[PDB]
């Protein structure tokens, strides 16, 4: 996360960390949507141009963590993966269309003050909140800068980072990049004319873009950190997988596959 701040304790209790098991390496973010289902980005698990094809046994998740500078005994939890589902039309060849995956946990987690699931948007939340200029919130332990920067560094922070960023109108998203954008994506970030800065970056993939409903005061996961070009460049915007658009897939996997 670039130009974010340290999270308050319990501020993002749906935050999930996706680690490589051998050796232990933080790969991506993720989010908790029940005691046993975690959302992430497909590319965190499967990306053939890089010979990446992680199986259930390659990975583990950590939940309820605030700081990497401590084992948070009695608070943080771990699970191995029972099953991975990648969207069957995830487009790794071209543009990461449908950059979404579900992971089912071998050890369902007990909810606590630090561990709690996020909502998925209903139609009303999507229509009302997915508007240019409306801000959502992005969280992660990924890189602090695109490139090593004096007096900041680059790579992973100790404390979970948080940044609030406005949704950007589709034509501006489209015009910002030569990569082909689709309706299963949106973009967010400040424009050069707004002065404020901030973005996701490498390592934040799979983390949630959440918005708080003014109607019922619940948090809803609208996006998944998916891709960008650099981080926090002027005239560039982070790209997010559009959770609502892909929700019927999520529901079918959870409702039907067991």
């Amino acid at each position: 996360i670039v130009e974010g701040s340290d999270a308050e304790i319990g501020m993002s209790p749906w935050q999930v960390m996706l680690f490589r098991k051998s050796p232990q390496e933080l790969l991506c973010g993720a989010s908790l949507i029940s005691d046993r289902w975690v959302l992430t980005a497909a590319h965190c698990l499967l990306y053939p141009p890089w010979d990446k094809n992680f199986t259930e046994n390659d990975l583990l998740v950590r939940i309820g963590k605030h700081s990497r500078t401590r084992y948070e005994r009695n608070i943080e939890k771990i699970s191995m993966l029972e099953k991975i589902y990648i969207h069957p039309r995830y487009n790794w060849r071209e543009n990461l269309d449908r950059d979404i995956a579900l992971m089912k946990l071998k050890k369902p987690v007990a909810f606590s003050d630090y561990i709690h699931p996020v909502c998925l948007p209903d139609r009303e939340t999507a229509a009302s909140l997915l508007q240019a200029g409306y801000k959502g919130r992005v969280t992660g332990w990924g890189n602090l800068k695109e490139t090593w920067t004096a007096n900041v560094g680059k790579g992973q922070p100790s404390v979970l980072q948080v940044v609030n960023l406005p949704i950007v109108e589709r034509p501006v998203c489209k015009d910002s990049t030569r990569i082909r954008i689709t309706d299963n994506m949106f973009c967010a970030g400040y424009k050069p004319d707004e002065g404020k800065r901030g973005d996701a970056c490498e390592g934040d993939s799979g983390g949630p873009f959440v918005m708080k409903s003014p109607f019922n005061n619940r948090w809803y996961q609208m996006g998944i950190v998916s891709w960008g070009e650099g981080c926090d460049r002027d005239g560039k915007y982070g790209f997010y997988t559009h959770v609502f658009r892909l929700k019927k897939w999520i529901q079918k996997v959870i409702d039907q596959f067991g």
Binding site: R89, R98, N184, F244, R245, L246, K247, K248, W249
Partner: peptide, 7 residues
């Protein structure tokens, strides 16, 4: 339309 590949 509203949802990807649905119905």
């Amino acid at each position: 339309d509203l949802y990807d590949y649905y119905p």
